[PDB]
Amino acid sequence: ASMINIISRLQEVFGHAIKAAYPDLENPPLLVTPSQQAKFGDYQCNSAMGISQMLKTKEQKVNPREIAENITKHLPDNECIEKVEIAGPGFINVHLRKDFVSEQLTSLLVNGVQLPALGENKKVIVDFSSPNIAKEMHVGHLRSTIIGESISRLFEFAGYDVLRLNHVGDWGTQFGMLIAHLQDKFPDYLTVSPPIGDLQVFYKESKKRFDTEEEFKKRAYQCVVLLQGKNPDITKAWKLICDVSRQELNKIYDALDVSLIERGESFYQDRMNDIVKEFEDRGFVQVDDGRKIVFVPGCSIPLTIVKSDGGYTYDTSDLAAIKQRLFEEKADMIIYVVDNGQSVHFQTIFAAAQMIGWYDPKVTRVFHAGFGVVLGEDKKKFKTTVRLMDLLGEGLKRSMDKLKEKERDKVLTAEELNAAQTSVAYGCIKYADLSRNRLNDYIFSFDKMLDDRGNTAAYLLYAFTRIRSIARLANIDEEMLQKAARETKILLDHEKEWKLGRCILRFPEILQKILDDLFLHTLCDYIYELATAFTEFYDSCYCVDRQKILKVNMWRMLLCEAVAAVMAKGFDILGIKPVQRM
Numbered sequence: 001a002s003m004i005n006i007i008s009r010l011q012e013v014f015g016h017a018i019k020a021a022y023p024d025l026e027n028p029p030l031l032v033t034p035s036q037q038a039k040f041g042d043y044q045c046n047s048a049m050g051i052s053q054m055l056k057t058k059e060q061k062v063n064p065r066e067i068a069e070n071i072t073k074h075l076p077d078n079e080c081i082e083k084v085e086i087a088g089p090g091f092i093n094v095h096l097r098k099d100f101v102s103e104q105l106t107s108l109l110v111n112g113v114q115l116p117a118l119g120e121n122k123k124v125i126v127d128f129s130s131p132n133i134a135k136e137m138h139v140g141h142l143r144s145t146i147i148g149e150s151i152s153r154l155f156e157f158a159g160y161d162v163l164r165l166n167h168v169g170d171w172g173t174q175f176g177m178l179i180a181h182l183q184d185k186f187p188d189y190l191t192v193s194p195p196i197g198d199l200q201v202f203y204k205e206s207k208k209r210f211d212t213e214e215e216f217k218k219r220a221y222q223c224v225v226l227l228q229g230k231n232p233d234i235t236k237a238w239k240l241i242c243d244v245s246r247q248e249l250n251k252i253y254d255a256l257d258v259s260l261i262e263r264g265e266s267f268y269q270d271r272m273n274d275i276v277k278e279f280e281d282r283g284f285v286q287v288d289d290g291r292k293i294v295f296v297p298g299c300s301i302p303l304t305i306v307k308s309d310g311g312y313t314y315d316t317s318d319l320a321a322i323k324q325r326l327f328e329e330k331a332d333m334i335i336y337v338v339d340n341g342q343s344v345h346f347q348t349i350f351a352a353a354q355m356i357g358w359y360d361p362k363v364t365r366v367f368h369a370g371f372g373v374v375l376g377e378d379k380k381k382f383k384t385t386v387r388l389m390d391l392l393g394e395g396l397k398r399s400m401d402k403l404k405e406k407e408r409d410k411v412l413t414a415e416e417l418n419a420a421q422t423s424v425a426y427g428c429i430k431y432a433d434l435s436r437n438r439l440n441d442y443i444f445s446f447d448k449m450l451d452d453r454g455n456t457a458a459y460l461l462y463a464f465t466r467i468r469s470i471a472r473l474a475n476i477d478e479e480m481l482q483k484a485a486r487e488t489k490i491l492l493d494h495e496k497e498w499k500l501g502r503c504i505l506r507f508p509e510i511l512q513k514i515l516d517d518l519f520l521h522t523l524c525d526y527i528y529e530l531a532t533a534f535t536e537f538y539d540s541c542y543c544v545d546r547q548k549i550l551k552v553n554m555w556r557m558l559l560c561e562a563v564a565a566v567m568a569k570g571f572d573i574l575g576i577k578p579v580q581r582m
């Protein structure tokens with residue numbers, strides 16, 4: 001059946017009701033918001049607010065309370081509204097049908113937590129992680145990965161078709177010295193696949209030679225020209241270096257549970273040729289100091305698309321990239337998950353793209369999802385540079401250390417030696433990030449994100465186990481619960497079970513908002529809000545003598561399951577893999 005965006009529903013029935021009360025008005029505000037207080041109803045409509053101000057005139061100000069009246073007067077029949085109240089000025093407070101909420105709570109237990117999805121299959125392309133080959137994958141790359149994996153999942157769950165592209169820096173000029181060095185240190189690479197160790201100790205070996213030996217430097221620069229010329233021997237040496245890089249990288253994408261089509265800058269070697277010609281032939285190119293540059297009317301900087309020496313650039317690659325994503329992949333939306341240091345870069349690229357006619361931003365969504373830098377607690381850059389695998393190993397350890405109080409004796413081997421340990425570590429590292437606005441800088445603290453209390457993954461993961469233990473400890477297997485759900489009316493007479501009930505149905509309205517601003521932290525803020533609504537429900541209501549059985553209220557067994565299902569999905573979107581026991 002799939003869940004209902006209640007906010008979008010109330011917006012439909014108010015726009016019907018507003019068109020009736022003021023049909024001569026054009027595009028009136030349909031600001032419907034959840035009431036975050038018991039008395040004011042379950043949703044609020046602040047629409048007589050902006051409607052009064054549209055009718056405002058030099059010497060006449062229509063009082064909003066009289067509008068709200070004229071609005072409620074024409075409210076159609078529905079399936080979700082009990083009564084309507086007017087407070088203050090023209091606030092319209094809305095009360096939901098208990099029946100409606102109950103029926104909806106049920107529907108997601110039998111049909112399950114799934115979204116309605118679309119009437120057209122749009123194609124979202126998400127550009128994330130993107131480390132630079134031969135250089136360490138750094139924490140800023142980590143954010144992108146985490147944020148990108150989660151964004152990809154939100155659209156995947158929303159019914160979109162999603163292309164996860166790892167746009168890796170595998171076409172740098174630094175390959176020159178690596179390849180030239182590889183040919184020195186391992187003169188049989190063509191035949192004996194060379195044992196290159198740590199790619200960082202190798203790179204170091206090169207930049208020394210580069211900065212030291214002048215005849216080596218020239219060789220290095222020549223290798224780049226030869227590589228771009230697609231030379232057989234030189235290219236093989238390149239493939240082999242990216243190979244050693246690729247398998248160290250997968251160790252990380254594996255641990256963080258991340259799927260990615262690798263499609264580096266090198267993928268566009270030929271399109272770049274055509275792009276340069278395509279900008280030339282439309283007269284957008286200007287020659288400055290031997291560079292072919294492009295000025296975009298409005299932008300603070302120019303794109304360099306050919307250097308003085310014939311070599312392409314980041315701008316060249318990202319121009320080729322957006323043309324093919326728009327034309328061959330035929331995307332309806334493109335998302336770039338890249339550190340905010342490069343904000344200007346994408347606004348100029350996107351501009352350049354409109355300028356040459358590649359897309360109509362009214363029609364195709366192109367979006368830079370930016371993020372702040374990673375800091376230590378001393379509120380400056382995060383360094384020691386930190387290897388990502390080290391960070392995670394140091395996460396796994398710490399996660400384990402916590403668990404030794406004293407759960408190594410309760411949970412069995414699997415439930416703990418992985419399940420709880422890993423699900424907590426990786427879960428915290430993702431959650432600490434996503435729970436904070438992606439734009440603000442991020443303070444990476446093992447101590448803060450591993451805290452057993454507060455707004456951490458740790459608390460919410462533990463919290464999850466308790467919701468699951470309830471119907472477990474009272475011995476009600478899945479088979480029973482599914483039959484209960486199919487036959488039980490769900491009861492919401494008690495205040496705190498009404499809070500929890502409508503909090504639950506807010507899941508769609510939450511995710512929709514995130515499809516528009518890509519602010520995932522409002523989902524974490526929702527998992528915490530849901531999680532807290534539950535405790536307040538549990539601490540007063542009974543689900544389950546002073547001898548054994550305190551009777552089972554089967555409908556509250558289902559409430560617990562509703563809460564569980566929705567947290568389960570919310571976790572999945574965020575990239576958290578919850579355990580049951582811990």
Ligand SMILES: N=C(N)NOCC[C@H](N)C(=O)O
Pocket residue numbers: 127129130131132167168169318321336338
């Ligand atoms: N420009 C695109 N498509 N992705 O960003 C690439 C990130 C780059 N490799 C870096 O090191 O920042």
